[PDB]
Design a protein around this motif. Structure first.
Motif, mmCIF file in Angstrom:
data_model
loop_
_atom_site.group_PDB
_atom_site.id
_atom_site.type_symbol
_atom_site.label_atom_id
_atom_site.label_comp_id
_atom_site.label_asym_id
_atom_site.label_seq_id
_atom_site.Cartn_x
_atom_site.Cartn_y
_atom_site.Cartn_z
ATOM 1 N N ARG A 10 0.858 -1.227 0.000
ATOM 2 C CA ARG A 10 0.000 0.000 0.000
ATOM 3 C C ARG A 10 0.883 1.262 0.000
ATOM 4 N N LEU A 11 1.878 1.311 0.876
ATOM 5 C CA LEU A 11 2.846 2.410 0.891
ATOM 6 C C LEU A 11 3.534 2.562 -0.484
ATOM 7 N N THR A 12 3.899 1.434 -1.085
ATOM 8 C CA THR A 12 4.565 1.423 -2.359
ATOM 9 C C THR A 12 3.621 1.922 -3.408
ATOM 10 N N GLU A 13 2.370 1.499 -3.328
ATOM 11 C CA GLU A 13 1.394 1.987 -4.297
ATOM 12 C C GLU A 13 1.092 3.511 -4.123
ATOM 13 N N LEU A 14 1.029 3.951 -2.880
ATOM 14 C CA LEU A 14 0.823 5.379 -2.578
ATOM 15 C C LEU A 14 1.996 6.178 -3.145
ATOM 16 N N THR A 15 3.212 5.634 -2.943
ATOM 17 C CA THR A 15 4.428 6.213 -3.483
ATOM 18 C C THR A 15 4.358 6.304 -4.972
ATOM 19 N N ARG A 16 3.824 5.269 -5.666
ATOM 20 C CA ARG A 16 3.651 5.347 -7.117
ATOM 21 C C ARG A 16 2.694 6.472 -7.502
ATOM 22 N N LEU A 17 1.577 6.582 -6.806
ATOM 23 C CA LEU A 17 0.559 7.599 -7.164
ATOM 24 C C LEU A 17 1.097 9.032 -6.880
ATOM 25 N N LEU A 18 1.754 9.206 -5.732
ATOM 26 C CA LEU A 18 2.389 10.488 -5.388
ATOM 27 C C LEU A 18 3.496 10.904 -6.355
ATOM 28 N N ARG A 19 4.250 9.947 -6.902
ATOM 29 C CA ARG A 19 5.246 10.266 -7.918
ATOM 30 C C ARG A 19 4.601 10.860 -9.150
ATOM 31 N N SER A 20 3.480 10.295 -9.572
ATOM 32 C CA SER A 20 2.737 10.837 -10.698
ATOM 33 C C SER A 20 2.161 12.281 -10.389
ATOM 34 N N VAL A 21 1.544 12.436 -9.213
ATOM 35 C CA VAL A 21 1.107 13.756 -8.715
ATOM 36 C C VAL A 21 2.281 14.763 -8.744
ATOM 37 N N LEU A 22 3.435 14.367 -8.228
ATOM 38 C CA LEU A 22 4.601 15.245 -8.180
ATOM 39 C C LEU A 22 5.033 15.702 -9.573
ATOM 40 N N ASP A 23 5.054 14.745 -10.501
ATOM 41 C CA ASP A 23 5.408 15.059 -11.892
ATOM 42 C C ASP A 23 4.446 16.032 -12.512
ATOM 43 N N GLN A 24 3.159 15.807 -12.304
ATOM 44 C CA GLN A 24 2.138 16.697 -12.792
ATOM 45 C C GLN A 24 2.253 18.108 -12.174
ATOM 46 N N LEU A 25 2.581 18.180 -10.894
ATOM 47 C CA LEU A 25 2.702 19.487 -10.198
ATOM 48 C C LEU A 25 3.912 20.231 -10.707
ATOM 49 N N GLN A 26 5.008 19.505 -10.855
ATOM 50 C CA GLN A 26 6.203 20.101 -11.323
ATOM 51 C C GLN A 26 6.077 20.617 -12.786
ATOM 52 N N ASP A 27 5.233 19.999 -13.622
ATOM 53 C CA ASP A 27 4.980 20.520 -14.982
ATOM 54 C C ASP A 27 4.319 21.866 -14.957
ATOM 55 N N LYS A 28 3.616 22.183 -13.882
ATOM 56 C CA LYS A 28 3.043 23.493 -13.738
ATOM 57 C C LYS A 28 4.044 24.550 -13.317
ATOM 58 N N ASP A 29 5.327 24.182 -13.282
ATOM 59 C CA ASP A 29 6.448 25.106 -12.979
ATOM 60 C C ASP A 29 7.488 25.033 -14.101
ATOM 61 N N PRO A 30 7.111 25.424 -15.343
ATOM 62 C CA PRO A 30 8.050 25.207 -16.475
ATOM 63 C C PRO A 30 9.278 26.107 -16.382
ATOM 64 N N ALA A 31 9.167 27.223 -15.667
ATOM 65 C CA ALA A 31 10.355 28.030 -15.358
ATOM 66 C C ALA A 31 11.360 27.405 -14.336
ATOM 67 N N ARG A 32 10.974 26.333 -13.638
ATOM 68 C CA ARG A 32 11.852 25.669 -12.668
ATOM 69 C C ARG A 32 12.275 26.570 -11.503
ATOM 70 N N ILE A 33 11.364 27.485 -11.126
ATOM 71 C CA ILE A 33 11.534 28.371 -9.987
ATOM 72 C C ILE A 33 11.581 27.599 -8.658
ATOM 73 N N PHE A 34 10.851 26.495 -8.599
ATOM 74 C CA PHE A 34 10.685 25.672 -7.376
ATOM 75 C C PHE A 34 11.411 24.307 -7.416
ATOM 76 N N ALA A 35 12.190 24.072 -8.482
ATOM 77 C CA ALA A 35 12.933 22.813 -8.691
ATOM 78 C C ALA A 35 13.925 22.441 -7.615
ATOM 79 N N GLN A 36 14.594 23.438 -7.040
ATOM 80 C CA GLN A 36 15.740 23.184 -6.146
ATOM 81 C C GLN A 36 15.623 24.100 -4.906
ATOM 82 N N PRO A 37 16.276 23.737 -3.800
ATOM 83 C CA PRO A 37 16.284 24.619 -2.649
ATOM 84 C C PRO A 37 16.776 26.015 -2.958
ATOM 85 N N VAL A 38 16.188 27.007 -2.316
ATOM 86 C CA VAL A 38 16.774 28.350 -2.325
ATOM 87 C C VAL A 38 18.273 28.241 -1.847
#
Length: 121
Positions: A10-38
């Motif tokens: 279940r944790l592994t499956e949640l991890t799979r779903l969250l990885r997809s969510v993360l990818d989708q969220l990160q596509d909404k940052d095409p400038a890569r302003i939030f990609a790396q720590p300040v």
């Protein structure tokens, strides 16, 4: 135990779903302003302002160590990214504006992720 394993599946499956969510969220940052720590080299005062820094690379390390037990924890981290930015940067900056847009666009993705986590258990 067999239960420990099922829990781990279940944790592994949640991890799979969250990885997809993360990818989708990160596509909404095409400038890569939030990609790396300040950078503390480039913003040496940052931690006087922001007590809990966050960024997409740091979320990704947590993710791949299966460090998110539930969607709530993941969302806390995404919200830090946005909220930190909107405090440190003024309203008329490219940074603040990029956070607003990420928040608005991410809302849609997160709304369905919650339904999928509840639905699949």
């Amino acid at each position: 135990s067999m239960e420990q394993v099922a829990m781990e599946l279940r944790l592994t499956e949640l991890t799979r779903l969250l990885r997809s969510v993360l990818d989708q969220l990160q596509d909404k940052d095409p400038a890569r302003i939030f990609a790396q720590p300040v950078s503390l080299k480039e913003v040496p005062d940052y931690l006087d302002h922001i007590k809990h820094p966050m960024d997409f690379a740091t979320m990704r390390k947590r993710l791949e160590a299966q460090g998110y037990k539930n969607l709530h924890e993941f969302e806390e981290d995404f919200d830090l990214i946005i909220d930190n930015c909107m405090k440190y940067n003024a309203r008329d900056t490219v940074f603040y504006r990029a956070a607003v847009r990420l928040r608005d666009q991410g809302g849609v993705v997160l709304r369905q992720a919650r339904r999928e986590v509840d639905s699949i258990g």
